Design an enzyme around this catalytic site. Structure first.
Site, PDB file in Angstrom:
ATOM      1  N   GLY A  22      23.367   2.961 -26.324  1.00 54.08           N
ATOM      2  CA  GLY A  22      23.340   1.648 -26.941  1.00 54.08           C
ATOM      3  C   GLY A  22      22.840   1.721 -28.372  1.00 54.08           C
ATOM      4  O   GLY A  22      22.891   0.741 -29.110  1.00 54.08           O
ATOM      5  N   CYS A  69      24.072   3.558 -30.720  1.00 55.62           N
ATOM      6  CA  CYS A  69      25.143   3.840 -31.664  1.00 55.62           C
ATOM      7  C   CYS A  69      25.231   2.716 -32.694  1.00 55.62           C
ATOM      8  O   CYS A  69      25.003   1.547 -32.373  1.00 55.62           O
ATOM      9  CB  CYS A  69      26.483   4.024 -30.937  1.00 55.62           C
ATOM     10  SG  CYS A  69      26.514   5.416 -29.769  1.00 55.62           S
ATOM     11  N   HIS A 126      34.372   4.118 -32.423  1.00 57.50           N
ATOM     12  CA  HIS A 126      34.540   4.371 -30.996  1.00 57.50           C
ATOM     13  C   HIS A 126      34.123   3.172 -30.140  1.00 57.50           C
ATOM     14  O   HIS A 126      34.094   3.240 -28.909  1.00 57.50           O
ATOM     15  CB  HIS A 126      33.850   5.675 -30.566  1.00 57.50           C
ATOM     16  CG  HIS A 126      32.363   5.570 -30.388  1.00 57.50           C
ATOM     17  ND1 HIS A 126      31.468   6.209 -31.220  1.00 57.50           N
ATOM     18  CD2 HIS A 126      31.616   4.940 -29.450  1.00 57.50           C
ATOM     19  CE1 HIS A 126      30.237   5.967 -30.810  1.00 57.50           C
ATOM     20  NE2 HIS A 126      30.298   5.195 -29.739  1.00 57.50           N
TER      21      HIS A 126
END
EC number: 3.4.19.12
Lengths: 302, 302
Positions: free
Chosen positions: B143, B145, B41
């Site tokens: 952030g 991820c 993503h």
């Protein structure tokens, strides 16, 4: 997001853990530059502990009586000395992995990360708090002596703890990185016992602020309380008194939640009197006091 | 000694955390050899999330549309592809710090260490458990991820988790290191919700065994119970059923304490029915279920 008592990444410190063998005794040492630090009781043996005299015991040693290994490699000790409860061993090799560092004496209530080692080999990292009674509730098996506690600010490792002893209580004790004990404790296998362990009030509020920030806010109320009336309750419950100073610290968190520190105290007072009554805060059947305002803020913003 | 939910030393893994920027979107990537892994993503934007089609969205990108940095340095991506929910980016530079590693899909109930990163820069390490509902109760801000969960066996890093999403519940979800989601979850900002979170029964017993080993044994009793009668209680209390297999696992710990697993179940049954009634176990007003038998054994011997 969430809240977990985290420890700092242990990488920078793993590169400083060595092993120090002296006679029939092995433990962990902290290698920074060309000095290797470690607990001085490395020169003791079983019945030495009953009542060591470190002056005598050490006079009977030389550089050659300390075997230190960095990994499998051997470092050659070319000087020794005693600083309070620490041995400082000079060595030929400076450490390539030596980080920007410094030694600091931490204050009670403050938290730090522990890197549990055995035989110069890091076992795991966890965070903990320096209790008001000067003990840490840690996890240290035999061989864990010389393991260090620290904090990382920017790129700079602030060392603040080295492990030495386990108290009858099953709780631990050690020194700053100048061999000064945190607490009344000494390095003798004797009768010493831990004082009474009061709850770190300021830390319990920080955590409540953390809970509110995470939607867990069932514990709030319309009431407020004067600083005095609060401490009068706190003290009944073995809680550290609250100063206008602790309160000031809690400022940014009060501002971030629109909850007044004195309102939050009222919340706490109710929890202390009425109990938690089954319900959970941030998933705890009890109030967490090993998370400091600074800890909570670096983990709880947008 | 004691017991603390510890995480593995994060050093070996810190050397693999990079940063991956794509358009207005930045997150964390896992650099092993010449491949950099990360959540797919990274190619999405705000209203992309509403209902992404990753096939379309990705076809519109090239190697040059992915900026990745190792520290300050820049890596040049020379290939991309999609694997389930992961992007695999080939790069020119192999990683000098690449450790003996492997990818494993962890099972529910099992624990692992999380290294929280932001912009390729490690923030802290903590341990956690993969819940029975397939969520982890973690701490992940925006952030975070692409941050990874892992375990270290010997000198070998077994990667088992990469972070992707935060659920409405405030609990988290991600994938194994093949981009397969743990759970029913998908990478869309939609209505998905977490299933019901049952207590990891086997883990709660391991921890009781840990408590007994640490002198905290006020909860024991003369009673015992058949496997059946126990589960009948457990299930009332949202506890995972108990198999003769879980029981077998608890063997060495039963042998180490001379406490029969079925006796310990009886202990648990009383705690579940009578409540904990104020008292604390290993210092908890509640039963810990994010420590596995293996966890407890490596921390509790002599």
């Amino acid at each position: 997001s969430g809240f977990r008592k985290m420890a700092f990444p242990s990488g920078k410190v793993e590169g400083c853990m060595v092993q120090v063998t002296c006679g029939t005794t092995t433990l962990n040492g902290l290698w920074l530059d060309d000095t290797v630090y470690c607990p001085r009781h490395v020169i003791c043996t079983a019945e030495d502990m009953l009542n060591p005299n470190y002056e005598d015991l050490l006079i009977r040693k030389s550089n050659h009586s300390f075997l230190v290994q960095a990994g499998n490699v051997q470092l050659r000790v070319i000087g020794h000395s005693m600083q309070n409860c620490l041995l400082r061993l000079k060595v030929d090799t400076s450490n390539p992995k030596t980080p920007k560092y410094k030694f600091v004496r931490i204050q009670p209530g403050q938290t730090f990360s522990v890197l549990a080692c055995y035989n110069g080999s890091p076992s795991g990292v966890y965070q903990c708090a320096m209790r008001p009674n000067h003990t840490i509730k840690g996890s240290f098996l035999n061989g864990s002596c010389g393991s260090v506690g620290f904090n990382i600010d920017y790129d700079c490792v602030s060392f603040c703890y080295m492990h030495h002893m386990e108290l009858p209580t099953g709780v631990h004790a050690g020194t700053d990185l100048e061999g000064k004990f945190y607490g009344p404790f000494v390095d003798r296998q004797t009768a010493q016992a831990a004082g009474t362990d009061t709850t770190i009030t300021l830390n319990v509020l920080a955590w409540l602020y953390a809970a509110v920030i995470n939607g867990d806010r069932w514990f709030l109320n319309r009431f407020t309380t004067t600083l005095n009336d609060f401490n009068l309750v706190a003290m009944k419950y073995n809680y550290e008194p609250l100063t206008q100073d602790h309160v000031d610290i809690l400022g940014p968190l009060s501002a971030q939640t629109g909850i007044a520190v004195l309102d939050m105290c009222a919340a706490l007072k109710e929890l202390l009197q009425n109990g938690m009554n089954g319900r959970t805060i941030l998933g705890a059947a009890a109030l967490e006091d090993e998370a400091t305002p600074f800890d909570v803020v670096r983990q709880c913003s947008g």
